[PDB]
Amino acid sequence: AEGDDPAKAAFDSLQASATEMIGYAWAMVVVIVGATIGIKLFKKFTSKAS
Amino acid sequence: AEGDDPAKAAFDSLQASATEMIGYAWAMVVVIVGATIGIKLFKKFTSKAS
Amino acid sequence: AEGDDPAKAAFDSLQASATEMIGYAWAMVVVIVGATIGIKLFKKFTSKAS
Amino acid sequence: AEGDDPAKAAFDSLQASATEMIGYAWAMVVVIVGATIGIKLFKKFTSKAS
Amino acid sequence: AEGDDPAKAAFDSLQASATEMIGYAWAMVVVIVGATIGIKLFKKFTSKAS
Amino acid sequence: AEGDDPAKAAFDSLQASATEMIGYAWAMVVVIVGATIGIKLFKKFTSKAS
Amino acid sequence: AEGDDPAKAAFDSLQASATEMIGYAWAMVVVIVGATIGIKLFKKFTSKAS
Amino acid sequence: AEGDDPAKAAFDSLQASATEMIGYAWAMVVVIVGATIGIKLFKKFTSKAS
Amino acid sequence: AEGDDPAKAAFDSLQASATEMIGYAWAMVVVIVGATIGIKLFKKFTSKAS
Amino acid sequence: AEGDDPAKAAFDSLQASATEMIGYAWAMVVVIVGATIGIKLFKKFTSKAS
Amino acid sequence: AEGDDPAKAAFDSLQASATEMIGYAWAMVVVIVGATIGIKLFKKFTSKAS
Amino acid sequence: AEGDDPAKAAFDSLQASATEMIGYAWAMVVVIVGATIGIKLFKKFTSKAS
Amino acid sequence: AEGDDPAKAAFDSLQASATEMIGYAWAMVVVIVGATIGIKLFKKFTSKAS
Amino acid sequence: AEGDDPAKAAFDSLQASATEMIGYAWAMVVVIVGATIGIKLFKKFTSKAS
Amino acid sequence: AEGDDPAKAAFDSLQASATEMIGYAWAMVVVIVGATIGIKLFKKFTSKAS
Secondary structure (H helix, E strand, O other): OOOHHHHHHHHHHHEEEEEEEEHHHHHHHHHHHHHHHHHHHHHHHHHHOO | OOOOOOHHHHHHHHHHHHHHHHHHHHHHHHHHHHHHHHHHHHHHHHHHHH | OOOOOOHHHHHHHHHHHHHHHHHHHHHHHHHHHHHHHHHHHHHHHHHHOO | OOOOOOHHHHHHHHHHHHHHHHHHHHHHHHHHHHHHHHHHHHHHHHOOOO | OOHHHHHHHHHHHHHHHHHHHHHHHHHHHHHHHHHHHHHHHHHHHHHOOO | OOOHHHHOOOOOOHHHHHHHHHHHHHHHHHHHHHHHHHHHHHHHHHHHHH | OOOHHHHHHHHHHHHHHHHHHHHHHHHHHHHHHHHHHHHHHHHHHHHHHO | OOOOHHHHHHHHHHHHHHHHHHHHHHHHHHHHHHHHHHHHHHHHHHHHHH | OOHHHHHHHHHHHHHHHHHHHHHHHHHHHHHHHHHHHHHHHHHHHHHHOO | OOOOOOHHHHHHHHHHHHHHHHHHHHHHHHHHHHHHHHHHHHHHHHOOOO | OOOHHHHHHHHHHHHHHHHHHHHHHHHHHHHHHHHHHHHHHHHHHHHHOO | OOOOOHHHHHHHHHHHHHHHHHHHHHHHHHHHHHHHHHHHHHHHHHHHOO | OOOOHHHHHHHHHHHHHHHHHHHHHHHHHHHHHHEEEEEEEHHHHHHHOO | OOOOOOHHHHHHHHHHHHHHHHHHHHHHHHHHHHHHHHHHHHHHHHHHHO | OOOOHHHHHHHHHHHHHHHHEEEEEHHHHHHHHHHHHHHHHHHHHHHHHH
């Protein structure tokens, strides 16, 4: 109930850091998935021609 | 039985502090799990296309 | 055998105080375990999706 | 044998919480599987036409 | 050899309490495993269809 | 060499008491280990199914 | 060398319990594999017809 | 009841010193935890990509 | 150099007890591994059929 | 309140040392993760070609 | 702030060792991937002929 | 400088006893580690098969 | 530098045991791979006939 | 500053012993990794053939 | 204020001895950590190959 008010910023500081790097894990998958899905389509173009 | 009444607030003060930071451990996992599960779905989108 | 009757309340007073704070050590673990176990389940939700 | 009667509710409280979130892990897979299986069928519709 | 007869109930009281909460650790895993295994089967239903 | 013969029973009395409670520490671990190991097996049943 | 004779039953009791649940992990896979393999054959029946 | 008034400052002086170094034990864990948690996230970024 | 000759049996007695239970930890893993590996083979039988 | 002013540098000296080695734990993970993630991509290049 | 200058070389020595073996994990995947991808191409040569 | 010559054997007698039981602490760990490491290998045999 | 000469055999004894069981992990994979690859060939015989 | 010169050999003796057994922990992992990696390659040989 | 000048060297002599052996506790951890971290990397090389 006391001595934690200035510790409350401690964890909001770690959590705020989490949101910064979390944006990298979310875009990371999408950066990789861009090709993941786009490549799928390249092969679709391949098998469909038969 | 005596001399503990004003100590009773001592631990309710530590426990009340616990409930404050406990809310961070609960939301912490969910902040991280948001992506954890959301990313799962990104890959599902990847394997399903085959 | 004598001079201890009014000391008998002395220790029942310390022991009665023990039962007061002991209730905090028992609920303390459970307050913390609530999340301990609940969080376990959050991650179960994470690994299971694969 | 004593001092555990009011702790018995402690774990029934954590277990009752488990049943709440467990319903999410069970429906979660089915929410995802809905499409998982439904999509399978979309592709079946694709290969069958040959 | 003496002064322990009324202490013998002390530990049978702690051990009897152990058997009470032990039933929760045993059913706990099974409550969680119910879904653990049941979900496995949901996914089996998913991969098998290919 | 003298005045210890009736004290010899003193310690055999404390040691005999030790053997009584020692049986509780030995079975205690096994009471807890019963589940400890049995639960291990529950999870083995879980990971093996993949 | 002594005080373990009545503990020897302790572990034979946990191991004997292992053999009980182990029969479930062995039949479990086979219960699931019954379909696993049987379904394979259903699809073989499908691709072979071309 | 007398001769302790100028000793009352003695302990408020030791306790006031405690609050000074206590701020170091609280921030110390957070200085170390900053990385503790931040690193967790680095690895999450690692396992998630599979 | 003296007063330890009859203590030498003390530890050979604990060590001899170790060799008794150690045989359980060695066979324990193998009892569990029997299925561990045998089950692997059950699944090999499953994936190979494709 | 007194005799701690020249001790205040004591802990700022240990904490300042922490920040020095902490930079190694942060870059350490990244030095290792460089490859961790980069290698992931090498394998992505492998499975995608099918 | 002091007594860490000659420890600074301690970790640069472990990190410098990391860069040595890290070159093996990077080339390792490529040594294996050489064939991984090259073999892909061997099979492409196989299916294309139809 | 005098009256300690026949006490010098006193401690060489306790130290010589130390070397006797010390051989048990050294082999003790190895008796237990035999299985510790050997079991590791049993599980390696388990995970490797995937 | 002393008291380790008779411990040197301790680890050469565990390592020598490793080489014994390691031969099982190496042949184990090959025992299983015999069929793994041989079966591949059975199916090659199947698809080639079209 | 005095009475430690003949103790300096004490720790160089324990540290020199560390370097002896440390060579076992380093080669130990490699003895086990030999197969760890070599087996990986056995399976690569397995999946590649498809 | 007097009779301590030639005692001042007493503790600088014990403290100077501390700095001598302290260098062993600092390098000790690093001697052990060399492998601790280096081995980590050996296993990274192991899991990454999948």
